[PDB]
Design a protein around this ligand. Structure first.
Ligand SMILES: [Mg+2]
Lengths: 304, 195, 132, 343, 150
RNA sequence: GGACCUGGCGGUGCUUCAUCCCUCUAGAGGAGCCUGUUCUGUAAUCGAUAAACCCCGAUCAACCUCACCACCUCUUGCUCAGCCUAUAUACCGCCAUCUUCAGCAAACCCUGAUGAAGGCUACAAAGUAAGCGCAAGUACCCACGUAAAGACGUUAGGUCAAGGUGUAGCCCAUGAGGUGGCAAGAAAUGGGCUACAUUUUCUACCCCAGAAAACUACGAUAGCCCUUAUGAAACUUAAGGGUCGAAGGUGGAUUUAGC
């Protein structure tokens, strides 16, 4: 209940003061981050679930935001859309519809739509898939319409940033170069590409033609420079370790491409990315499962 | 697959990226802008931007590969190309001036023409048309299976494959015979095409 | 169907504590181990002896506090110390609790030749994490 | 081996076989069966065969102001203590075995007429201690489902009434009989009719109604006539609070149809006050026991009509052949007016 | 389902009326194309096929499909795009015959496993050398006895 | 007997699906051997045994293990005895199977006149707040993938021989101990290994080589013999060497696995 929440808030304030005393810091400037660090130090827990570790947050966060009963002592609900059972969702829809009406009166890249779980957390109300789809359609109709700054801010409450994903150094002799790293399977490589050179690659201190006898590995090495037409114009010193011949070739290729990105133009960097020369390959060996011959092959189902 | 569905296949073609902006259509401009924001898979270890890269030959080598022995399959393929080139050069030098115009010495052209000749236009039972990919796969598989036949004893794969490719380039050899047999069987079973 | 250490739902009324509620695949994910000792670490030794000691301690404590225990024990080992942390219901008079604490500490100390401490936390009733 | 022993809960779970396919199916008859017992019912900590007295655990820590020492009971007194423990266990078992009977319904093996007590109290100060619940029928409906084939379920018809004119009935479907009882009575308490009663003991006028295929003919009766009605009607009338009434049920004797037709007829009856208000005339009651004295039971609250109601010499009503035959005495029946227990 | 069937019938009737009238198109009117089937999911139209004239009919229909959809929108205004499918009997046969003309041919008992049973018999030779069912409704229940007991 | 409801079924209609079929790769089905089962034999275990048994309990048997057999011995016995004696059709415990599922079960509410029964339409028309499962979260290298998870229920599914336990049975023996012993193939079948080679074999090397290439080829991890390792005990087990160079020549229907 509300009185319970008030008591929890008072207890949290007292506990915050006590924790500040315990860690020897100013209670007046003991932020939530300090509280979390102190709790993690005093009550260490290796449990992988972060929600299972000890927590002493504010009651506004520990307790669900569904709040106590939505009516006072008289029993009158606070919200006028309470009897809809989804007062948050329908209030939001009503506000969006009012915004659309006002837009009628007056007259993509780094963001995505929050998932249904995120919206449910926002409104602390359970919602159906079709309800979420209807709200998304309304929001997208709002966006497509000539939305103003206020509507853009309203949408940004639901926009979620998309997860889309170089230095130049000088040696002791003033040779401008770039250094980068790459991984492929188990092989790990570190490459150094100099700004000016005459196409000489030394792998582990050994020339590539003597270190990579297979023509395929040399072709993989040639791929980045040949893509940007810079064959024979750069000097590369790279060291690779682990894996086999092809894994090492791929790791060196990725490291060389990433390092060479420091010299080619931004459009050339984008072209290299679109060619796949910069994406770290996540294809790694899959573990063998018990009761099976291999990663995916089952044992021969016995003849019947 | 470890790649999320958001990831797109890479496009390894230097002409595509060096193409002038003016020649690009509005649709192509939108495609490029979209690709500027799309996650792209890592370039596979097989294909590169090399001007000498041949996707047909790469696929043929992959089909020849046994137990992931890409090195040996590639060695067999390059040995076959060298054998075809050497035999064609011998024929060219042993031929008169008039015949030298007709003799072809490009191993890649010979290989492509041989595979094109071996491609069966029709397939099967009810005879049915075959799509392009199925045609190419059938041609390659027929060539490889014929070259792997035990009928040739102690002859290495490069020599057998070169001989069969040269036979196919002249519209002869057991592979063309197999294609003709499939065509004749489809013609015979044409009466069942109503199924 | 997996049956190990799981409390199968029957009617939605049977109460279970936090540990009983969680299935074995939640160990080290949502629930820690009930015994902490360096036996199972890399290169360490005497894991079997510590396991036998822990099993005997759990059985002895369960049979020494009949119905008093409200949850599983926690057996911590620091050096040669041995702390048995238990959660006990407030049934018996504290005289019996103190007698049992002294008894168990002395007997276990003489039986395992290590200083055994017994820390009791009392609860009014068995803590209910959920109902099954 | 000590390490091979288990806890009491596991042992009971294993031995009692409370779970498993045998309990679900019951193919193996278990007349010779085991029941759970509390092994720790009366055990005292610190008591054993050796009969030791541990200060602070099973004997008082301080006796006469001094700390007691470790003492062991003599063999005779320890034997007496063990015998007393055995006798106390036997007494506990005997008290467990004893019980108290109940009152049967219409018949010794029928649920009809058996009381279920008051309906469960409402969430907020909404209690029904004034209400009584009675079972009218219990039926084992078997439903054919795709996987399990024949599945048993219990359909129970209950009626609840406070004895002061407020009563209702409801149906409850469940897998267990008690769940059906609870559902049915807690739902019937929400479907309460109000049956107007003449003088709080009988109906206002003779009623004759057919519900579906069930004819109910109820006759208003004077005080002391009792309830001469179908046993279900007797139960429902006791719940409503009707003491004197006659009722004959003809046609189908479907219990649910009879019950809800009875409730319909009782609810739709017209009181004397309503009749007086409708026709604007005094409702004058003539009693043979009171002679020719006219008793006014209801007067119209509005204006009183001046024109007398037309007095047709021959009323146009649909009589019942049974009633006419009974009045004329030709209704010979070896089953009518049989002496029966008090209702 | 029945509503969709009636919608398919109405679409068939409308397309037939558009085909028959000359006002839609002189080309289409001269073709006198007849429809074997009309089915809505997009709309698939199937017309009977008479080769050169068949190709001409298909080409004219493909050219006039947009105008036909526009005219249908006048009526049923929300009409999905109409797909014309040429019914060359079994179209696979026609395409197969076309390719075959194009293609090149170059120079020109007892119903048992008696053996298994015989083996089993030889193996054998070598090794040698109802009740009442109670009615569900009549089963007794002792719950009431227990309730009355206590 | 009339009407209806639910289920089952239809040589029942329609619609849409999946690895159901074709397509791709490598296998099995032919050979030898390893191992498992079955059968026979023996004085000589048990259990699993259609998918869901068949390199299964075993992450393992020369003695021990061992529960089998023969012979001999003991009787308050290691145990406030004991039993691997019967019952998985009394159970706990741990799992298989659908599950490569998404639903389940309570507590209510409503409809059918308060009949059995039924309860969906998103521009929504009686269903629902909670619980369990999926999901989410977490582990591994990501947000993907693989693990893990996977309710209720189905097969009286498996285990009384992990252990515990109900019932029943044994107590000079169905208990306990000691010595010695099986374990062979006339076979059938399941899985696996090695092959039948030239994309191969041997050597060097770890991929720019030289030879071999059909009766002195390829091909045994088999047999025979001799060492060695472990052990008290080895023709038994394993490793190595010698010797032998066998069957076999890419294998029918059918069948397994993979994205
Ligand atoms: Mg009786």
């Amino acid at each position: 209940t509300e009185d319970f929440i008030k008591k929890q808030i008072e207890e949290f304030n007292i506990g915050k003061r006590h924790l500040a005393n315990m860690m020897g810091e100013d209670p007046e400037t003991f932020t939530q981050e300090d509280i979390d660090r102190a709790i993690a130090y005093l009550f260490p827990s290796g449990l992988f679930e972060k929600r299972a570790r000890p927590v002493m947050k504010h009651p506004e966060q520990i307790f669900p935001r569904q709040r106590a009963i939505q009516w006072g002592e008289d029993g009158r609900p606070f919200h006028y859309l309470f009897y809809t059972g989804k007062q948050s969702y329908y209030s939001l829809m009503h506000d969006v519809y009012g915004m659309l009406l006002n837009l009628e009166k007056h007259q993509v890249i780094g963001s995505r739509w929050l998932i249904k779980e995120e919206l449910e957390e926002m409104l602390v109300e359970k919602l159906s898939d079709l309800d979420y789809m209807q709200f998304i359609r309304l929001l997208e109709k709002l966006l497509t319409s000539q939305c103003g700054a206020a509507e853009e801010e309203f949408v940004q409450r639901f926009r979620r940033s998309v997860t889309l994903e170089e230095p130049v150094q000088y040696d002791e002799q003033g040779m401008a170069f770039s250094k980068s790293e790459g991984k492929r399977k188990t092989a790990k490589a570190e490459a150094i590409v100099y700004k000016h050179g005459s196409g000489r690659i030394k792998v582990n201190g050994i020339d590539y033609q003597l270190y990579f006898p297979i023509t395929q590995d040399r072709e993989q090495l040639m791929f980045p420079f040949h893509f940007v037409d810079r064959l024979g114009k750069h000097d590369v010193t790279c060291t690779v370790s682990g894996g086999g011949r092809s894994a090492q070739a791929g790791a060196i290729r990725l490291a060389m491409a990433k390092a060479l990105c420091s010299f080619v133009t931004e459009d050339e960097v984008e072209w290299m990315r679109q060619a796949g020369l910069l994406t770290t390959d996540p294809r790694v060996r899959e573990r063998k499962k018990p009761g099976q011959e291999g990663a995916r092959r089952k044992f021969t189902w016995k003849k019947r | 697959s470890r790649y999320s569905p958001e990831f797109k296949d890479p496009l390894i073609d230097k002409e595509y990226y060096r193409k002038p902006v003016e020649e690009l259509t509005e649709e192509e401009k939108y495609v490029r802008e979209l690709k500027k924001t799309q996650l792209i898979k890592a370039a596979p270890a097989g294909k590169t931007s090399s001007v000498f890269e041949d996707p047909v030959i790469s696929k043929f080598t992959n089909m020849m590969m046994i137990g992931g022995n890409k090195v040996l399959a590639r060695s067999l393929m390059i040995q076959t190309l060298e054998a075809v080139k050497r035999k064609q050069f011998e024929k060219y030098h042993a031929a008169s001036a008039e015949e030298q115009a007709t003799i072809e010495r490009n191993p890649y052209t010979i290989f492509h023409q041989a595979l094109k000749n071996c491609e069966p236009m029709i397939g099967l039972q009810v005879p049915v048309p075959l799509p392009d990919r199925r045609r190419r796969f059938l041609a390659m598989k027929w060539m490889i299976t014929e070259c792997r036949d035990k009928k040739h004893q102690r002859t290495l794969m490069p020599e057998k494959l070169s001989h069969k490719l040269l036979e196919a380039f002249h519209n002869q050899g057991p592979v063309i015979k197999r294609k003709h047999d499939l065509h004749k069987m489809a013609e015979a079973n044409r009466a069942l095409a109503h199924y | 169907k997996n049956r190990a250490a799981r409390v199968r739902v029957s009617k939605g009324d049977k109460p279970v504590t936090y540990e009983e509620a969680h299935a074995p695949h939640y160990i080290a994910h949502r629930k820690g181990w009930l015994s902490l000792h360096t036996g199972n670490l890399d290169g360490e030794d005497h894991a079997a002896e510590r396991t036998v000691e822990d099993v005997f301690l759990r059985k002895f404590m369960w049979g020494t506090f009949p119905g008093c225990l409200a949850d599983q024990l926690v057996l911590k080992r620091r050096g040669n110390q041995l702390e048995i942390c238990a959660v006990v219901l407030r049934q018996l008079s504290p005289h019996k609790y103190y007698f049992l604490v002294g008894y168990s500490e002395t007997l276990l100390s003489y039986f395992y030749k290590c200083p055994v401490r017994l820390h009791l936390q009392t609860v009014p009733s068995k803590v209910v994490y959920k109902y099954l | 081996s000590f390490f091979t022993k288990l806890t009491a809960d596991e042992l009971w779970k294993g031995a009692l076989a409370e779970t498993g396919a045998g309990a679900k199916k019951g193919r193996g008859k278990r007349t010779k069966k085991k029941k759970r017992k509390d092994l720790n019912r009366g055990q005292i900590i610190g008591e054993g065969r050796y009969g030791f007295l541990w200060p602070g655990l099973n004997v008082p820590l301080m006796k006469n102001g001094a700390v007691q020492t470790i003492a062991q009971r003599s063999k005779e007194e320890q034997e007496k203590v063990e015998a007393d423990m055995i006798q106390q266990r036997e007494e506990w078992d005997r008290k467990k075995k004893m019980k108290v009977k109940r009152e049967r319904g219409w018949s010794g093996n029928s649920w009809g007429g058996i009381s279920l007590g008051p309906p469960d109290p409402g969430p907020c100060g909404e209690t029904y201690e004034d209400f009584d619940t009675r079972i009218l029928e219990v039926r084992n409906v078997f439903t054919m489902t795709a996987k399990e084939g024949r599945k048993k379920s219990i359909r129970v018809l209950v009626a609840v009434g406070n004895g002061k004119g407020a009563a209702g009935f409801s149906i409850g479907k469940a897998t267990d009989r008690m769940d059906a009882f609870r559902k049915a009575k807690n739902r019937a308490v929400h479907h309460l009719h109000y049956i107007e009663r003449y003088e709080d003991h009988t109906i206002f006028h003779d009623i004759s109604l057919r519900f579906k295929r069930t004819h109910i003919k109820m006759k208003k009766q004077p005080k002391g006539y009792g309830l001469r009605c179908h046993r279900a009607i007797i139960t429902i009338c006791r719940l409503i609070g009707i003491k004197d009434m006659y009722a004959k049920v003809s046609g189908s004797i479907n219990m649910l149809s009879l019950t809800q037709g009875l409730f319909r007829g009782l609810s739709r009856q017209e009181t004397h006050q309503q009749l007086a208000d409708k026709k604007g005339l005094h409702v004058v009651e003539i009693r043979e026991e009171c002679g020719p004295l006219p008793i006014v039971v209801a007067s119209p609250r509005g204006p009183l009509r001046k024109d007398p109601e037309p007095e047709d010499e021959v009323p146009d009503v649909k009589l019942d052949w049974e009633d006419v035959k009974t009045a004329q005495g030709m209704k010979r029946s070896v089953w009518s007016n049989l002496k029966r227990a008090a209702t | 389902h029945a509503r969709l069937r009636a919608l398919n019938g109405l679409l068939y009737k409308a397309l037939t009326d558009l085909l028959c009238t000359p006002e839609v198109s002189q080309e289409l009117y001269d073709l006198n194309v007849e429809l074997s089937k009309v089915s809505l999911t997009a709309c698939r139209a199937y017309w009977k096929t008479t080769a050169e004239q068949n190709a001409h009919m298909e080409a004219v229909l493909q050219r006039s499909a947009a105008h036909m959809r526009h005219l249908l929108m006048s009526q049923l205004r929300n009409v999905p795009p109409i797909v014309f499918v040429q019914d060359k009997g079994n179209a696979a046969l026609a395409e197969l015959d076309q390719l075959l003309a194009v293609a090149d041919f170059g120079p020109r008992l007892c119903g048992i496993d008696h053996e298994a049973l015989n083996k089993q018999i030889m193996e054998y030779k070598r090794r040698k050398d109802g009740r009442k069912r109670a009615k569900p409704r009549l089963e007794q229940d002792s719950s009431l006895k227990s309730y009355l007991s206590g």
